[PDB]
Design a protein around this ligand. Structure first.
Ligand SMILES: [Mg+2]
Ligand SMILES: [Mg+2]
Ligand SMILES: [Mg+2]
Ligand SMILES: [Mg+2]
Ligand SMILES: [Mg+2]
Ligand SMILES: [Mg+2]
Ligand SMILES: [Mg+2]
Ligand SMILES: [Mg+2]
Ligand SMILES: [Mg+2]
Ligand SMILES: [Zn+2]
Lengths: 132, 287, 148, 108, 152, 275, 166
RNA sequence: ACUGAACUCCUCACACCCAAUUGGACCAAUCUAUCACCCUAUAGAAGAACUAAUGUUAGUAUAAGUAACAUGAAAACAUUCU
């Protein structure tokens, strides 16, 4: 629902542009369904800022649309299994534990393919340059 | 009934299309690299078994879509509407290339197919028409040919100039309709199922299946007209601009059956000829 | 002017007089203020006349809001869906009575120019004139100067 | 003579939206089969011409360095040679202009 | 009325026209390739051809020497005209120059032309090439040619 | 800035009116708008129609099955009008058949059936219910009320009237609110037919009469783009009906329609319905 | 001033149902305060109205007017933002649905005349607006045929009533 | 003979077609008193109402994209030439 007022308190400012920038001017239909394995803490470290790495293996649904309401990412009905390593940060007096950064391992499987095709231009050539 | 034959062939064709698209689910992203001289190195992240060289041209620009008529996919000519199957290198072939031999062959093949559709839908119901084959004739020959066996009732009838002009008028009606050239690489079993009534097409499908290491047979459809081709075709009938069914010649061995060869000539929009040059080409194609 | 105004043809709602007469006014809504001289006449109308009008017009549901927005008003809703809003600001009791009776008597059709003072669905009983009425026929239907 | 009346926007639109005043659509624009650039049929491809002009400017800078001064036009022919090229038997007795780049594909 | 008038009106008058063409021609002889407004190039092309003819007339020809002296404002080009350009075209009889239209000048949108002396050492201009003989129309015409040759 | 408030407020009111005209709010059922009392409205419904309904029957008539289903679904987080609508539909069809057969004894059963279908169709009943305010009192799950639901509720109201006051009063109601819907209507505007000439030939065979001879009675400008033809159908040299047209075929077809109207007694100048 | 054209890109439609035709993408772009007469810009805008993006770019690349280059830059920017931000699959699958020029904020200068008199020169500025719609350019309106003309005339003839009578 | 007015009649309703001038009935907006407290009322006031002064100021038109204006040539942008 683009509840940015609550999102500011829910996630860290380091994470907020990632949360709300690319999702601007498009409706997302993210929904949650029962998790697969219980969440557990992984490790914690430390003017002073807290940090907690938590591993989750849940099941989620995504459906990202356009300005015009046409689907461009993910089926809305079929759920997917998500493995995430979410790192929380806390302020150390009134702050709480907010999503700071999601760690994506290099061995993580590739994400869902996108509906539309894409063209990737080659290196542009100046008049004095030749393609090699 | 000819209408029943067309309906059943279309139903089988659509059944095969649905079966193949279902067999290819999801969206697998293949990588196709433009290997042509212009816009070199551009990579299209296309959808496997859905995206086409037409889609790649659309990504490039509108000039590519308008002028590009064949696709060398990894060096092999590909119909512009033939869904791509794997990551590969693509090059678009136009009529005005340095050596447009493959494009010329494809244009001749597609013009012959259009002629075949016109012949099938021209004659009256009483007379029966069997399109035996479209012989692969060189462009230098001056005409594209389609061989057909007509009803024995017409074993002496020869089309008049008005009949030929009516044939050309029907061909121009197809051109105005601007029907895309749908393609399918099907199994010989399904091809024989589609063309079971036509013995000539049955044996031609058998020849093509034998030639190919597998039982893959190319089936082409303009609209409601399915036929077996010897290679890739042009995208749309609207590519043809000047089109004329020039003449009909009965082949020498008339004793088994009367194989009448419909000879015509055509030129695309990109290569329009002046009126006088076109008339001379018509005269040459009437032979 | 007529040219700068919409027009319609004379009509009823559902052939309102053929079988039976149905009063087309179905709802009256008086928004009246407790205080405020603008609705003094409306208050007196509610005190002295709205009950008699209601019992004279059993087919009209009358609402009295006693808390208006802007000026005191009477909103008349008709069967055909028309809504006519009339301000009863600074109107006397008799003025409001006449206005309400006019709303009760009229139909919901737009008060715009009416093209014709009459409306027939059967303008002709003997057959509408055409050029061949009153024209005699000729033997074998021969047109003038026809040889045969 | 001064105008007798203000001209209305209706009259003015009828005048200045006439087809005689509208910009005509050009139908001689095509694509250079060489490089795929837009060109008019009778006019040189702008991008190809810019390429040729830049190379000519470099060659002429080298020519100026070789000549070293005004009024020094050689009375002998000139040949441009790129890296990895040697004067031919025909190129003998012709002043050599050496270019530091490699031979362009469009140059021959 | 200008029926049959073959010369443009350029510069500030007749002398100015001649001087403008002379400067363009001197530039053409020096650089062997010149950009200039299309009309001025078209006017100067005839003088370029006539200069090559005068150079062919010979170094020792007094009339040719006087013509070259007038028409080349930089005198180091006269030996060039007589010992490079004319020998380059001794075999030819005409068409020593190549004139092509160029995209309009960005300054004033002027119609522009490039004029060069054929056979220069500069990179070749992107000449217009006819359609390949292997195109569909050309192949059909080749078939016509072969049939006509065989029949008649 | 100019001191004052009244002009600014007037401008705000005009802006609000223009905004309502440009982007009118989605239609909302009258029940959800202010000044609504369902009991008073349903009483005034009967008093308007000058009929003594029984309030329970009318309330049941106005409530649909879909409304009950939606109400139960909402309650998760009443007697429908089905039988009343069935009774009303059956009685209305039979009484309309009686009316039409008494008025036009020469009309065939197919014609009477088509007329009754027109008079009880979704379009006619929808129009009548909308202008009788049935839609306002209708309890449905979606708004605006679809014509099928509106027709069902209207016939439920007719059935409620039947149970409350009787067949005679219900017949008067049907005469007043459905029979009047054919006033000004043309026979074949209500009963769509194909091949009126063939249908006329069938009727003449039923009457043991030979097929009529189509014959050109009058014509004008035959060779122009605006011809007028009058074609008359003759039964044994006797004119039964003539009709105009642009082409001879159209004129003949229209003459067939005129002959059918005359045979069925549904001519334009027939005796008007008695009320 | 008004800046509604910029805001027209920020409207988000509700997601479409599966049984609903795909809504074509619409991209609004503008250049404000172009040193050019809006009357001169109008001809270029009118020229490229209704054409595909590639056809418009080709036409503008060979037009001598100063505004042609500006409109070409605006169209290229609109194409780029159409691909990047408005989820347009193909660059070339766009046509100019709207192209207009508007008056900009202009500056007044003095033009000296010959007898101590003067005029007020206006340093004219113009805006330029485009809407690009995804898809092939809509076909041009076919010319009226004789059959269509005759049909319209006969409809008018049939529409006649007997006026000012019962 | 008919046609033929704002004359006259007919159905209904009525203060509702002269300049200057004069009598009268109303009245927009504003402020104030007191209300209303919703956008009005009763009064008291007054910088109290603009299709017109070659009116003043500002905006933008029309004439008009018109009149008019401007940069000698090539080039290696070094330079050379006229
Ligand atoms: Mg001059
Ligand atoms: Mg009179
Ligand atoms: Mg009088
Ligand atoms: Mg004043
Ligand atoms: Mg004013
Ligand atoms: Mg004034
Ligand atoms: Mg202007
Ligand atoms: Mg003028
Ligand atoms: Mg001038
Ligand atoms: Zn090029």
């Amino acid at each position: 629902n683009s509840d940015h007022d609550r999102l500011h308190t829910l996630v860290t400012e380091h994470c907020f542009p990632d949360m709300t920038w690319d999702i601007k001017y498009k409706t997302v239909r993210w929904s949650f369904v029962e998790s697969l394995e219980p969440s557990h803490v992984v490790q914690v470290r430390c003017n002073v800022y807290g940090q907690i790495t938590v591993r989750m293996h849940t099941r989620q649904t995504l459906a990202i649309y356009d300005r015009f309401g046409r689907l461009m990412y993910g089926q809305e009905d079929v759920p997917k299994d998500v493995l995430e390593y979410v790192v929380f940060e806390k302020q150390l007096p009134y702050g709480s534990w907010r999503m700071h950064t999601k760690i994506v391992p290099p061995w993580a499987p590739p994400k869902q393919p996108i509906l539309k095709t894409v063209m990737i231009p080659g290196p542009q050539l100046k008049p004095e340059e030749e393609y090699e | 009934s000819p209408t029943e034959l067309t309906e059943m062939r279309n139903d089988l064709f659509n059944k095969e299309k649905a079966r193949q698209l279902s067999l290819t689910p999801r969206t697998e992203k293949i990588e196709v690299k433009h290997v042509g001289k212009t816009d070199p190195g551009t990579v299209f992240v296309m959808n496997k078994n859905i995206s086409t060289p037409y889609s790649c041209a659309m990504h490039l620009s509108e000039w590519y879509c308008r002028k590009s008529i064949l696709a060398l996919v990894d060096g092999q000519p590909w119909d512009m509407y033939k869904p791509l199957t794997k990551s590969c290198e693509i090059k678009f072939l136009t009529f005005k290339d340095c050596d447009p031999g493959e494009v010329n062959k494809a244009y001749w093949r597609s013009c012959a197919m259009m002629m075949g559709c016109v012949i099938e839908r021209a004659f009256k119901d009483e007379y029966m028409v069997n399109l035996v084959r479209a012989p692969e004739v060189p462009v230098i020959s001056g005409a594209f040919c389609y061989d057909v066996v007509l009803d024995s009732k017409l074993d002496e009838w020869m089309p008049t100039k008005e009949n030929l002009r009516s044939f050309t008028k029907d061909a121009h009606a197809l051109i105005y309709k601007d029907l895309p050239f749908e393609t399918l690489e099907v199994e010989a079993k399904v091809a024989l199922e589609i063309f079971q009534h036509s013995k000539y097409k049955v044996d031609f499908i058998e020849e093509k299946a034998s030639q190919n290491p597998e039982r893959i047979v190319k089936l082409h459809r303009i609209g409601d007209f399915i036929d077996v081709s010897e290679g890739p075709l042009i995208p749309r009938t609207s590519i043809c601009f000047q089109y004329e069914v020039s003449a009909v010649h009965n082949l020498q061995p008339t004793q088994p059956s009367l194989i009448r060869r419909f000879q015509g000539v055509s030129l695309p929009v990109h290569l329009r000829a002046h009126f006088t040059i076109w008339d001379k080409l018509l005269e040459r194609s009437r032979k | 002017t007529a040219r700068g105004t919409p027009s319609r043809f004379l009509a009823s709602v559902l052939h309102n007089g053929l079988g039976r007469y149905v009063q087309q006014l179905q709802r009256l809504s008086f928004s009246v203020s407790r205080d405020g001289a603008s609705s003094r006449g409306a208050r007196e109308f509610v005190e002295r006349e709205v009950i008699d009008f209601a019992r004279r017009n059993p087919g009209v549901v009358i609402y009295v809001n006693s808390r208006p927005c802007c000026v005191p008003r009477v909103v008349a809703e008709y069967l055909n869906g028309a809504v006519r809003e009339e301000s009863i600001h600074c109107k006397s009791v008799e003025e409001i009575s006449t206005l309400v009776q006019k709303l009760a008597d009229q139909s919901g059709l737009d008060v715009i120019r009416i093209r014709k003072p009459f409306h027939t669905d059967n303008p002709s009983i003997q057959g509408q004139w055409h050029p061949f009425t009153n024209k005699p026929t000729t033997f074998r239907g021969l047109r003038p100067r026809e040889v045969q | 003579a001064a105008p007798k009346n203000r001209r209305t926007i209706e009259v003015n639109r009828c005048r200045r939206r006439n087809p005689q005043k509208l910009i005509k659509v050009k139908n001689n624009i095509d694509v250079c089969p060489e490089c795929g650039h837009l060109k008019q049929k009778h006019v040189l491809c702008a991008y190809c011409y810019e390429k040729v002009c830049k190379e000519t400017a470099e060659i002429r800078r080298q020519i100026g360095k070789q000549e070293g001064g005004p009024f020094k036009a050689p009375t002998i022919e000139t040949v441009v040679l790129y890296t990895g090229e040697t004067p031919s038997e025909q190129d003998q007795g012709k002043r050599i202009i050496e270019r530091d780049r490699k031979r362009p594909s469009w140059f021959t | 009325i200008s029926h049959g008038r073959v010369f443009r009106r350029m510069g500030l008058g007749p002398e100015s026209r001649i001087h403008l063409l002379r400067n363009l021609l001197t530039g053409l002889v020096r650089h062997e390739r010149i950009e200039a407004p299309w009309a001025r190039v078209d006017e100067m092309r005839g003088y370029a051809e006539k200069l090559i003819d005068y150079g062919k007339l010979g170094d020792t020809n007094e009339r040719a020497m006087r013509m070259a002296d007038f028409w080349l404002t930089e005198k180091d080009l006269i030996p060039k005209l007589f010992q490079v350009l004319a020998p380059r075209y001794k075999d030819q009889t005409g068409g020593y120059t190549r004139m092509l239209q160029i995209p309009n000048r960005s300054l004033d949108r002027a119609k522009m032309a490039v004029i060069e002396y054929k056979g220069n050492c500069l990179p070749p201009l992107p000449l217009p090439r006819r359609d390949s003989h292997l195109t569909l129309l050309n192949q059909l015409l080749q078939g016509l040619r072969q049939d006509l040759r065989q029949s008649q | 800035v100019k001191k004052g408030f009244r002009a600014a407020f007037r401008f705000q009111k005009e802006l609000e009116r223009q905004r309502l005209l440009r982007c009118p709010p989605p239609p909302v059922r009258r029940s959800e708008k202010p000044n609504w009392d369902y009991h008073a409205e349903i009483q005034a419904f009967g008093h308007r129609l000058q009929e003594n309904f029984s309030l329970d029957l009318l309330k049941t008539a106005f409530v649909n099955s879909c409304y009950i289903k939606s109400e139960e679904a909402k309650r998760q987080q009443l007697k429908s009008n089905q039988e009343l609508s069935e009774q009303g539909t059956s009685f209305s069809q039979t009484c309309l058949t009686q009316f039409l057969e008494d008025e036009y004894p020469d009309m065939p059963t197919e014609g009477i059936k088509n007329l009754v279908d027109f008079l009880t169709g979704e379009e006619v009943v929808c129009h009548v219910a909308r202008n009788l305010a049935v839609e306002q009192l209708t309890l449905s799950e979606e708004f605006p009320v679809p014509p099928a639901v509106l027709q069902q509720t209207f016939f439920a109201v007719i059935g409620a009237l039947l149970q409350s006051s009787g067949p005679e009063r219900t017949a008067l109601f049907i005469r007043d609110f459905l029979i009047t819907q054919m006033t000004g209507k043309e026979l074949f505007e209500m009963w769509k037919i194909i091949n009126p000439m063939g249908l006329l030939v069938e009727e003449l065979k039923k009457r043991n009469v030979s097929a009529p001879e189509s014959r050109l009675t009058r014509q004008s400008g035959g060779t122009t783009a605006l011809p007028l033809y009058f074609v008359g159908l003759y039964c044994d040299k006797k004119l039964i009906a003539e009709g105009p047209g642009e082409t001879v075929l159209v004129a003949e077809e229209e003459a067939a329609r005129v002959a059918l109207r005359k045979l069925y007694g549904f001519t334009e100048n027939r005796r008007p319905w008695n009320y | 001033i008004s800046r509604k054209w910029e805001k027209k890109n920020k409207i988000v439609y509700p997601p479409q149902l599966p049984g609903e035709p795909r809504r074509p993408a619409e991209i609004y772009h503008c250049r404000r305060q172009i040193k050019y007469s809006k009357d001169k810009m109008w001809y270029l805008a009118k020229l490229i109205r209704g054409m595909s993006i590639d056809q418009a770019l080709a036409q503008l690349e060979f037009n001598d007017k100063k505004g042609a280059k500006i409109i070409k830059e605006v169209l290229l920017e609109a194409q780029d933002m159409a691909v990047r931000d408005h989820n347009v699959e193909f660059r070339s699958n766009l046509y100019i649905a709207e192209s207009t020029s508007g008056r900009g904020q202009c500056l007044k200068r003095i033009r000296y005349h010959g007898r101590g008199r003067f005029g007020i020169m206006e340093k004219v500025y113009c805006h330029y607006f485009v809407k690009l719609v995804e898809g092939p350019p809509p076909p041009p309106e076919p010319p009226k045929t004789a059959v269509a003309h005759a049909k319209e005339y006969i409809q008018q003839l049939r529409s006649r009533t007997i006026v000012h009578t019962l």
